[PDB]
Design a protein around this nucleic acid. Structure first.
Lengths: 98, 141, 60, 107, 125, 69
RNA sequence: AUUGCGAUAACGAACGACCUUAACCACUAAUAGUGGUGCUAGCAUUUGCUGGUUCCACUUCUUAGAGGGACUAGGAAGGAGGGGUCCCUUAGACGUUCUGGGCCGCACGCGCGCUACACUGACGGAGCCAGCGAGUCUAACCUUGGCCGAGAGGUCUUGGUAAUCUUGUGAAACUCCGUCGUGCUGGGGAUAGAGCAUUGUAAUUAUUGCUCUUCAACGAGGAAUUCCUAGUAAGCGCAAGUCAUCAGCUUGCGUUGAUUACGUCCCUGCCCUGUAC
């Protein structure tokens, strides 16, 4: 969860942050097809997909359901929270949406 | 007058099976309740006691409506699809040993008799018996 | 509120894939005041549309 | 269908074929959008209005009765009744609303 | 001997054949009364040529039909056609032409397929 | 939680007073707002119909439809 | 479309681009069908209704072969298909034949498929309907009927060189009445143990079939991507091919039978109509 927040801070949204492109904190992310900038008109719509896709997996297979989840005072991130335009890396590579 | 052709199928059969069981002359094979009736089936017949009488009734009607039949055609008639696991379904014949004893049993109570040109044909006493139950089934309405 | 209008003439196919038909439509409440509109589905003369916005005109 | 009309004749008391007609007329979208990227708002023809209504109604029923306890007839009956009312509880009414409000935004 | 006609009906590969002759109104299919035709849900599809013209028309004639090939559904559509065609053919020969066309008007108003086969055929290779 | 599969006296008393309230009853309804399992509901309907408390309008094994009367 | 009016330094000439289906009707013939007649069973008794087995009449249904039936005019239909095959080298020489093994080995990558994730279902009983094929004397093919066996299977006879017999290929989905009750459950059946048969000269690393036991992943599938406009897609099954045995394969056939367009050049791709380059 925290990894998605960092990218959104720096200015980018992965399109398909899901189990087909994560390898096994010990994880590493292996490709970034069709990434888009935080300025894109649909940024929230794709953002919630990534959060929803990662929630589905931990519920379905692992039964699971400052940080997020249990032991932290906020359950899981939300698009209008913790996004603060830190680094504008989307200008170094004009990903999409100027 | 009334004929077997005048009555609904799964209404004649239920009536006649109930009658035939009460008379108690129909001889059962004794290995009943072990047998699946088909190599395509899974689990044995669900009505543990009655199922042999039900089939005896069905065979009698099926012969009445036809010229003659033999054991092989009955196995085709009551066959079905077998699952074959991961491979696609296929048609499979029913057990011979059940049907053969059914015909032998009905012959002892005189409903059916061996025909020239092979197989079995309805007896005149078979006609008279089945026609009586048909009349009662309509009259009960 | 809704406004009904009656199709009196069909003008031609439009849009990048031909998915849209341009049509000339006459108001049903009072004749004249004719306007031209874009219709998504299959359409014929004498069909009735439900114009949910009135003071707007098809591009040309 | 035979069982569905029976149920509608007991929950409520109208002639059930009348209830079907209400659901159809009440559910079809009346404005839509097309891709030009950007979207532009357009009107929708009466025939397509009928097609959309039928599709939305049965799809809502099918999904409601998957992994169910209620049968198809139970869920289809409930959809039709709720959609003859203006009730937003029905799946189809929600879908219609989203199409139209998005079209309003872009026109 | 006795006034009689025979007619046939088609659907896809079913072929119903009907004999009509003077008598006392009875209708049998394969030797069984028409009230027993199966499947149950389609049974009114066969009553159509009776209820549409009215039962009084049949009191003087016997219909018996045999149906042969096809499948469970297609052969139901065959028999209804054989009855309708059979009925007009009887009137055409043994009563006036006026009543004949009175029948046709009723049938073709409801459903053209009561008199004319639909002519659809399997697609070639 | 789990649906009941054997009939306690409390639910038996509950059934007899509650069921006459409903416009429409079916296997699905008894399993929903009462909490008996489906194998009880099929038994209950045959009993209540025999007893005359509910009125049949159609029966089909895969569907059943009874009414208040 | 070099497919045509007209114009006029031109006029007149040469290749590429008819034949079989669907669909109506006279004529054939019967190994196909109907009706009557003689005999005969059951029910009921106006003299009916449903059947079994010796002749006679017919050809409408079926048959298959033959003959005729749209030209842009509402109507069956305003169609579908036919570049390849002189040099060198020679004793066991670009050989003969026998036994056993492999082609089936698998950390993996790419692709065509089969079976599922259930209630519009699984299981049990009952109902009950097709079309296209293929079959022995050269000898042993397709197999009805009787008997034995839980089953797979065995055994004694029989019809057919076939519109005649297997075969009404009584196919499956499907319809009706019950059990189950949303629980990786009675969904799903991989992997594995024990035993009984069949083909073959020979089944071990295991052709195939049957019985009991074992009970795995899978809760509708990301980026990408295939086929398709009506008796069509999809669901369901059967026959043939290869073939001692061995199909989840290929071709054909029938059964049930939808949704959505009747358009365009946005994407992919093809075709046609300034300059010595």
């Amino acid at each position: 969860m925290c990894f998605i927040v960092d990218l959104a801070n720096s200015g980018l949204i992965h399109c398909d942050f899901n189990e087909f492109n994560i390898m096994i904190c010990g994880f590493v992310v292996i490709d970034f097809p069709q990434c888009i900038s935080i300025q894109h008109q649909d940024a929230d719509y794709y953002f919630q997909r990534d959060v929803d896709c990662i929630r589905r997996f931990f519920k379905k297979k692992l039964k699971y359901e400052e940080g997020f989840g249990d032991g932290y005072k906020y359950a899981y991130p939300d698009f209008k929270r913790d996004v603060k335009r830190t680094d504008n890396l989307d200008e170094l590579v004009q990903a999409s949406g100027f | 007058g009334v004929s077997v052709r005048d009555v609904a199928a799964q209404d004649f059969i239920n009536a006649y099976a109930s009658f035939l069981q009460r008379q108690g002359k129909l001889e059962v094979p004794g290995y009943v309740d072990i047998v699946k009736t088909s190599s395509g089936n899974e689990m044995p017949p669900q009505d543990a006691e009655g199922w042999f009488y039900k089939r005896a009734a069905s065979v009698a009607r099926h012969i009445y409506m036809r010229k003659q039949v033999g054991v092989g055609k009955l196995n085709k008639l009551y066959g079905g699809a077998k699952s074959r696991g991961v491979r696609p379904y296929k048609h499979i014949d029913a057990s011979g040993s059940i049907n053969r004893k059914v015909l032998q049993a009905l012959e002892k109570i005189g409903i059916v008799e061996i025909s020239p040109k092979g197989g079995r044909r309805i007896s005149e006493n078979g006609q008279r018996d089945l026609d009586r139950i048909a009349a009662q089934t309509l009259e009960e309405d | 509120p809704v406004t009904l209008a009656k199709v009196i003439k069909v003008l031609g196919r439009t849009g990048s894939r031909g998915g849209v038909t341009q049509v000339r439509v006459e108001f049903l409440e009072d004749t004249s005041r004719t306007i031209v509109r874009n219709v998504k589905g299959p359409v014929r003369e004498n069909d009735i549309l439900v114009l949910m916005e009135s003071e707007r005109e098809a591009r040309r | 269908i035979k069982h569905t009309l029976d149920i509608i004749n007991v929950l409520t008391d109208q002639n059930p074929i009348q209830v079907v007609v209400d659901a159809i007329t009440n559910t079809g979208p009346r404005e839509d959008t097309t891709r030009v990227a950007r979207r532009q708002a357009v009107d929708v023809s009466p025939l397509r209005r009928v097609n959309q209504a039928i599709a939305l109604l049965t799809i809502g029923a099918r999904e409601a009765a998957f992994r169910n306890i209620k049968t198809i007839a139970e869920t289809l009956a409930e959809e039709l009744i709720n959609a003859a009312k203006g009730s937003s509880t029905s799946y189809a009414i929600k879908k219609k609303d989203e199409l139209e409000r998005v079209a309003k935004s872009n026109r | 001997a006795v006034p009689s006609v025979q007619t046939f009906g088609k659907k896809k590969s079913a072929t119903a054949v009907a004999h009509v002759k003077a008598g006392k109104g009875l209708i049998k299919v394969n030797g069984s009364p028409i009230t027993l035709v199966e499947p149950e849900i389609l049974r009114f599809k066969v009553y159509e040529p009776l209820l549409l013209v009215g039962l009084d028309k049949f009191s003087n004639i016997d219909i018996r039909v045999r149906v042969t090939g096809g499948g469970h559904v297609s052969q139901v559509y065959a028999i209804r056609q054989a009855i309708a065609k059979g009925l007009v053919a009887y009137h055409q020969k043994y009563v006036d032409e006026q009543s004949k066309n009175e029948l046709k008007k009723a049938f073709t108003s409801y459903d053209r397929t009561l008199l004319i086969a639909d002519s659809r055929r399997p697609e070639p290779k | 939680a789990q649906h009941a599969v054997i009939l306690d006296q409390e639910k038996y008393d509950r059934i007899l007073k509650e069921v006459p309230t409903y416009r429409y009853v079916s296997v699905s309804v008894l399993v929903d707002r009462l909490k008996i399992g489906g194998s009880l509901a099929r038994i209950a309907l045959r009993h209540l119909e025999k007893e005359g408390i509910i009125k049949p309008i159609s029966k089909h094994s895969k569907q059943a439809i009874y009414t208040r009367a």
